[PDB]
Design a protein around this ligand. Structure first.
Ligand code: CA
Ligand code: CA
Ligand code: CA
Ligand code: CA
Ligand code: CA
Ligand code: CA
Ligand code: CA
Ligand code: CA
Ligand code: CA
Ligand code: CA
Ligand code: CA
Ligand code: CA
Ligand code: FE
Ligand code: FE
Ligand code: ZN
Ligand code: ZN
Lengths: 587, 149, 587, 149
């Protein structure tokens, strides 16, 4: 042995050190604030309702023209409101090797709805991780439906707690590009607040003709290919240019140049450029070279190790930017790093420019079998990249399963409640047996709620929380035995996983004030800022005649802080508003 | 002796030394290596540790201080060092010897190595390490997951 | 010394051996047949006019709509018949760095004439080296006007004795693509029988939009860019697909595949495919996949070392073909090798598939300065490739000069005449002094012709040959002193070089019977074939009622052979017809 | 001795030997090397050839047969062989020593080496060899034109 045992032990311990450094910080991002805010919600209501008397005033305040295709269409009804079941139905329909063609009317409806929804979006979509505490970024797919299915199986379906970012190149060089595009649009429609789409260089009619996407569309739909391409043109026109993560990380497809400015980009009209390589010039005016150059650079640029900026000779489009250009861009735009995708890597990811540039690629076997692997980035609240590599297979694609997974935020609030409710478990069971002398284990909803409210006075909307504190309950009686098991065994509480009970917890606290907090959080820093509070007050006092007095804003801003650290967390703000409204409606 | 190393590597090698030297007296004792072996789930006991603490010492006494530890690991890194430690780590991770680290062996390692992970966390780690979709971690995936993060 | 001297001597001698092996064969390709045919022309007329009596019967037998541009147009008049002076004027106009924009009407005229002339050409242009005894093949240019100018300076201007072959990709990735295209069209119009153009993959409107050629056209001509692009579309539509050299060597841009057949290609209508990537489908009928696949393969294929045929994944278009596919193609089409161009090489040329595939590239510095060199292929009558490498420079482009060079065929006929006329030089000078007693050196055209005809009875049209046998002669008197110097000094005869006297020699012998011989030379083998003669007789006896009797054809076919080897050279046929006509007109 | 070579190289080496052995007796004489030196435009005479024919002989007699020629050239090709012959050829081609072979030196070589080329042929050869457009053949262009064709 000698060398072997000691070296193996030290290597395993070095891996353990990084594993712990990640895990403890991940759990600390929630638990230490969640315990304090739960203590606030349970006790500080007593101090809150004293000042509630003075703060009553303001704190509570065209058309279908398609034709029938041949005998290869399968029946899959799709309605205007996209939900989860539509997503699973589309996944099952597209997964089949034979007979995977849905009706043209549904494709047209999906494309029209996607274009209409994308029309209202701004040029750059801001993304915040206050609620989710995590974010996922995916690279180029190029019609590889197997890679998308593998990613969805590994990381779970998109949700408010699991946002997804796609960096373009959804089509071309793939046998299932249309299916990938339709699935992405369906996911975006089903989860508008969790799916972000960025435009790539391959999302072009000229690019489609060059790589034969129009031929694939014609082969799939020989009768209605023209209409489908016309609808896809609007989606290509209305695709957003990029996204920014917490005002620190910029996500773009190609890159940037020395003259690239985000201020000019935020003012560019996306509607004019249906095609980037060949602008339509429908308005009858000469093309603006300055405005088009920004889009061309951000779509076609690639990084280089050599200093200076030179035009990209290999691709014939875009420019090569060195580390100095990246440093100047980051200094000018006050950014940390940049995630991009465009060039294929053997491992699916690569660090460049002393880690100021991150390249992500998600299409496996881009050139040949085993040529390269696909990867995606998982980022926490502190925005540290984590790369997971995968290889897709055609045989295993039929055995995959997809779920919406369990939220990180919910994983702490329920656990702390279960831990702290153990002190009254015996009294709860005694009162249940008082209301249920036969110890059958079933009592009515009102009786159960009254019992546990009398045992632990909290005043929470226990009827909505019934779905969380009593799985399998009926509409007539509540199984309090499982409620006691939750206090006796944390395994039963944790085994909920994905479920329909999530909306019950979303009703409490997480109102539109969640988006209000993101609106008032200008710097995107954690637990707001007093400077942000005073800046918001300075325009909220005189923005409209119906505005309240400054002294009223100051008192409510000071009240929003519960633990007394001088800052107000998003959940702290939600809990303060929830307690205020609860006391207002109960008094 | 230690001239072959630089401060950049010594920064991690001092942590590696303190991994065994937990009591802080400045030299590794037999109990200190035994508790590390037990934490890693290893069998060897006094019958092997007594000879080890003198054979990998290169000094002639029954304890290992920092210079003595550095000396032998320096002799190691001067020679070929990369493959053997990784193979030994994979072997100790792979209890069954089938060449694929399943969920059960990984869970046994983590609970013996110091964690109290649940089934879902182990499953998530397995599915993240399982690059090829087989469901078990082979040698290449184990090396990738160990050298990553 | 020791090693150095001996090794240097043997290496120099090895180079000398190849140099001699080339040079002696090059001179033997002409001189040994030319001497025999000149002896025939001078003596066998005596035997010919005996049978002339029996063979008298058959042996002698829309619109302008352009607009004015801004103040950058230079004056350069261009007329419908393109000549050499137009070529030099265009070269001088395009060579200028500033002020190189000609009038839009001339560009439109050139494009319209080029399209009209290319419309009549077949899909595959047959090329024969019977007259020129040499041929030049050029690769991709991609708008590099400097490379084209360097090639023209090194190899000379195109002519009937110096044919030129271009393998497509004249535009895109260049700052002077329009100038290169206009120059190529002008050269083709000026020399229709010496310039052959093949269509490439970059000659596409989609390709132009992808690489920004339309933007270059718009920048050059902001007012008339649309009309210029519309005219260029017709030229792109009517470009020939390829050429075949002596029915042995096939020249294509991309390559071929396992299912590629020349018989199908020769029947494809070029007019339908204005654009290859995005066919227009103007006729209102579905696209024929089988017909389009042949063009797509011959335009986008690339060779591979691995056996078998697989689709080209790297380019996304075309297929990769191995040595087995090349061998099968050569066996099926009975070809020797194939010249192609498409992929860039460091040396500008590369041998692949045990030398069955030859790749030629002519654009230097394709990716960066010093990245690669440009090259072109020189082939003799036996079709052995010879590669000349060059590197273009912007500073030296203004010092280049262009000439039409001196023909190989003419270099032997004049030399043999001068050598064999030395035997009567003294008598010629004596008769000149008899007609010019003062020995002034000038006598009239009639007197001079009569004098040298009496000295050497040949009966040739000496008046037309005056331009060759007496440089600097006047319209009134002929300088016989220079004629005597030609016999005394071969340097004066050889110093003619390029000149206007070429047409005088082209009038004799080289009539349309030159093309007639190529028509009757079915197998393209040298000095015809008796099998070809009988095959031609077998359909020329009964093809039309005005045809002559078979016995008349047999006698004339036997008479066309002069030296008695059983075969008839092109020049032998021309000389026989010339002697027959001369005796007919003199008797 | 000759075992290190194969018939493929011997095919050219026999022609190289017969280049000097013009009389056909089977062994190179002093006059045979002298006439080759004169044909190449080289100065050396008896004062050098007499010592050469014995020093590069490796046998001890005043003539060089095929095995003796093959022996020394085999000793040469076993060592580094490529650069020195090319440098010597460029040096003898470059009479002026300026590093650029002009038309005059090339013409002098060709007329001395055995050709009777005219001015136009020499100009054509120069313009074909002149890759970079300078007008004179440098070392790289000379090497390319020698190894080509
Ligand atoms: Ca903040
Ligand atoms: Ca706080
Ligand atoms: Ca110790
Ligand atoms: Ca010791
Ligand atoms: Ca195992
Ligand atoms: Ca595996
Ligand atoms: Ca023939
Ligand atoms: Ca003949
Ligand atoms: Ca001899
Ligand atoms: Ca000897
Ligand atoms: Ca020189
Ligand atoms: Ca030079
Ligand atoms: Fe891409
Ligand atoms: Fe090209
Ligand atoms: Zn891309
Ligand atoms: Zn090409």
């Amino acid at each position: 042995m000698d060398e072997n045992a000691i070296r193996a032990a030290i290597f395993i311990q070095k891996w353990y050190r990084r594993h712990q450094a990640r895990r403890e910080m991940q759990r600390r991002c929630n638990w230490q604030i969640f315990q304090n805010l739960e203590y606030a919600s349970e006790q500080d209501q007593a101090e809150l309702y004293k000042f509630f008397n003075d703060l009553i005033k303001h704190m509570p305040q065209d058309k279908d023209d398609l034709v029938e295709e041949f005998g290869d269409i399968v029946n899959a009804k799709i309605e205007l409101p996209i939900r989860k079941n539509h997503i699973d139905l589309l996944i099952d329909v597209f997964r089949k090797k034979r007979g995977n063609r849905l009706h043209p009317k549904y494709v047209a409806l999906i494309l029209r709805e996607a274009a209409k929804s994308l029309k209202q979006l701004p040029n750059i979509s801001p993304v915040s991780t206050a609620v989710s505490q995590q974010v996922t970024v995916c690279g180029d797919l190029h019609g590889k439906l197997d890679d998308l299915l593998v990613v969805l199986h590994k990381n779970g379906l998109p949700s408010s707690s699991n946002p997804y970012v796609f960096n373009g190149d959804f089509v071309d060089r793939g046998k299932r590009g249309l299916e990938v595009l339709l699935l992405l649009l369906s996911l975006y429609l089903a989860f508008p607040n969790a799916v972000f789409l960025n435009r790539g260089n391959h999302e072009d009619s000229v690019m489609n003709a060059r790589y034969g996407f129009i031929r694939e569309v014609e082969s799939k739909y020989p009768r209605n290919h023209k209409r489908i391409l016309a609808f896809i043109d609007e989606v290509y026109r209305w695709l957003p240019l990029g996204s920014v993560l917490n005002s620190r990380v910029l996500i773009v497809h190609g890159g940037f140049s020395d003259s690239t400015s985000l201020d000019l980009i935020k003012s560019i009209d996306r509607g004019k450029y249906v095609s980037i390589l060949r602008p339509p010039l429908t308005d009858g005016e000469p093309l603006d070279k300055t405005e088009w150059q920004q889009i061309f650079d951000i779509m076609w640029s690639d990084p280089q190790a050599t200093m200076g900026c030179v035009p990209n000779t290999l691709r014939g489009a875009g420019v090569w930017f060195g580390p100095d250009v990246t440093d100047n861009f980051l200094q000018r735009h006050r950014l940390s790093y940049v995630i991009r995708s465009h060039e294929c890597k053997p491992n699916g990811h690569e660090f460049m420019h002393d880690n100021k540039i991150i390249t992500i690629f998600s299409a496996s076997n881009y050139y040949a079998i085993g040529s390269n692997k696909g990867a995606y980035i998982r980022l926490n609240n502190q925005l540290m990249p984590h790369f997971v590599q995968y290889i897709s297979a055609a045989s295993q694609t039929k055995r995959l399963s997809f779920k919406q997974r369990m939220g990180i935020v919910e994983s702490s609030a329920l656990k702390e409640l279960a831990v702290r409710m153990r002190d009254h478990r015996d009294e709860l069971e005694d009162e249940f047996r008082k209301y249920d002398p036969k110890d059958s284990g079933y009592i009515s909803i009102s009786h159960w709620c009254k019992v546990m409210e009398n045992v632990t006075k909290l005043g929470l909307p226990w009827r909505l929380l019934r779905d969380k504190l009593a799985p399998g309950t009926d509409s007539q009686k509540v199984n309090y035995n499982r409620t006691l098991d939750l206090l006796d065994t944390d395994v039963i509480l944790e085994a909920e996983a994905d479920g329909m009970s999530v909306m019950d917890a979303l009703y409490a606290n997480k109102a539109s004030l969640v988006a209000i907090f993101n609106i008032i959080d200008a710097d995107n820093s954690g637990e707001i800022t007093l400077d942000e509070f005073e800046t918001a007050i300075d325009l909220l006092v005189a923005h409209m005649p119906g505005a309240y007095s400054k002294a009223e804003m100051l008192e409510k801003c000071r009240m929003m802080d519960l633990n007394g650290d001088g800052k107000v967390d998003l959940n702290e703000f939600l809990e303060a508003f929830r307690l205020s409204d609860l006391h207002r409606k109960e008094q | 002796m230690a001239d072959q190393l630089t401060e950049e590597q010594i920064a991690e090698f001092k942590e590696a030394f303190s991994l065994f030297d937990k009591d802080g007296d400045g030299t590794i004792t037999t109990k200190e290596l035994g508790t590390v072996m037990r934490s890693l789930g290893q069998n060897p006991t006094e019958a092997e540790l007594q000879d080890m603490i003198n054979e990998v010492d290169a000094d002639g006494n029954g304890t290992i201080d920092f210079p003595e530890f550095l000396t032998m690991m320096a002799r190691k890194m001067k020679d070929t060092d990369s493959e053997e430690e990784i193979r030994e780590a994979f072997r100790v991770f792979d209890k069954d010897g089938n060449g694929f680290i399943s969920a059960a062996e990984l869970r046994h390692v983590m609970t013996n190595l110091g964690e109290k992970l649940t089934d879902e966390e182990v499953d998530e780690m397995i599915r993240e390490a399982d690059i090829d979709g087989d469901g078990q971690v082979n040698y290449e995936e184990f090396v990738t997951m160990m050298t990553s993060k």
